[PDB]
Design a protein around this nucleic acid. Sequence first.
RNA 1: AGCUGCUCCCUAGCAUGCUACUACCG
RNA 2: GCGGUAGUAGCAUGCUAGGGAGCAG
Lengths: 121, 72, 186, 187
Amino acid sequence: PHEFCSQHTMLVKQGDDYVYLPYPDPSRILGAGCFVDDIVKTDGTLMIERFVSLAIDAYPLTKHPNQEYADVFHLYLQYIRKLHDELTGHMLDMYSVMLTNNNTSRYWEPEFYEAMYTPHT
Amino acid sequence: KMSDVKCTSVVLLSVLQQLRVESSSKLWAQCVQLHNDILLAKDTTEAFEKMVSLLSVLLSMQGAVDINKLCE
Amino acid sequence: FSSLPSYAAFATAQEAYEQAVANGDSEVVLKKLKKSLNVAKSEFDRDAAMQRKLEKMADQAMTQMYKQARSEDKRAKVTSAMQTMLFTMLRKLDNDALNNIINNARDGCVPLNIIPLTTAAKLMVVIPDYNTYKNTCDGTTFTYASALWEIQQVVDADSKIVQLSEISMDNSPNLAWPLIVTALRA
Amino acid sequence: FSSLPSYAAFATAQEAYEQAVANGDSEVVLKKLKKSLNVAKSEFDRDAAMQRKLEKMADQAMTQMYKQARSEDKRAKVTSAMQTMLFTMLRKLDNDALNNIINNARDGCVPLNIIPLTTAAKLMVVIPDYNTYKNTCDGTTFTYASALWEIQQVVDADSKIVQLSEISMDNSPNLAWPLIVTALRAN
RNA sequence: AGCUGCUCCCUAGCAUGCUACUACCG
RNA sequence: GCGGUAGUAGCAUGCUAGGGAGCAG
């Protein structure tokens, strides 16, 4: 369908078969990235989860025929990575020993997002 | 490029707000109206006209030491 | 985890069992090496786990205190960082129209009202001194905001109309210098 | 977790154990002194673990009763507040004319909308534009709702006073322009 | 300064379940 | 050498509660 709850639909080959997936309107996502309410996002080096969820919403743009779309996804990824990096750098100086186990690296690998669209949960 | 001037407008309006400019309904109304129109503007030049038209408002009062910020 | 005291005991028991199962000795001797090594694992994890919990508490405390600090940090400096970011974006944006009035205002050319755009419509600016005027007021056309304005009603701080022609460096040291100029666009 | 009848049994059994172990005597010695870490500590398992749960449960009971107490406190506070609000609200209205129009009801029930319309003691009107003002509370007194109202005290959006003189046709583009006019019930 | 709905993350707690080794009886 | 009752630490599930954030109408 052309549009529903402000989502577009796209038929993508997920492995062996074909499935309908909803991708949003990129401008909306970008805007949500750029404009916020003070402390939020401003110094987002404490707010990564915002971007986690946002990327979740913007995954299907990966499978898209047109170009810049998937570039939005990769942009969010690399931004998350830079965020965590410059975060750890500050936290090290703040004290003198980085954290023991972050386990946050999974957040910037694509597969974890893909899991959010597959019939087994 | 136009994104630059738009975001600039946003920041500037936020500043005006911080300066308590909303204590005069006429002024605040003109400002908000200008800012809105900017954000919907789709040419390159009319944007700048409205932009300077706005910025004048900040130029009015003497709360923002201009020379100090002009330290480059 | 390694340098722990209980790890010394666990290491001793493990090495002793290693030597015993290497020599392939009796069964009655390992009855200790089992009842003396199981305990090592017992008297050992019941302390590697306990320090481990503290080792997670340290994290989930530091990772909180950090953001708690930089939070109130950023909610201390808005009406300061905001302005400098603004002017940074200005300088980067680069529009001669703007820079003109911005420099003018570093000088003193403060407008007492909104800059209009209608071909008619009035404009009221301020001028501190002579050269400002000479650098700006040229005949009866006014060049402001990189725009052409028609000079119509000069008046000094005594709120009295003053003759345009009278304005010149010679007799200027006699004027209520905050001059209020009014004009209209082209 | 220190002064218990199980602790003393532990201490004395362990003392006899140390004694007859430094003796290093019989196998019956080993039996009767392993029946110590094996029989004199079951009591020390129970009463030195059960008694650890008694404290936990008593203290959570204490904290929940604290929370319930503070809760019911807030209840009393808010009900006092709203009672005060009610009692102070009515203390501004009991003009006899209200009672009068009540007595005129065939039943004693009247539609709400007409109570303040007829019985209020002060009217406030909000005006957008000049022509509109002209077509209503122009002049120093006017009429409305079959009654006579007199103007006094007029403010603006910025909530600053303004006199009737300034309200010209061409001075109007100089004001926060949706004015508030407060008028009084003239007899 | 709302009504819902979905989603992620963090934390606690309970209980289960399970694991095993340590202690009592068969 | 097995079976039943007591510990430990670990693991799994789940359930509750608590807290943060985002999207849709």
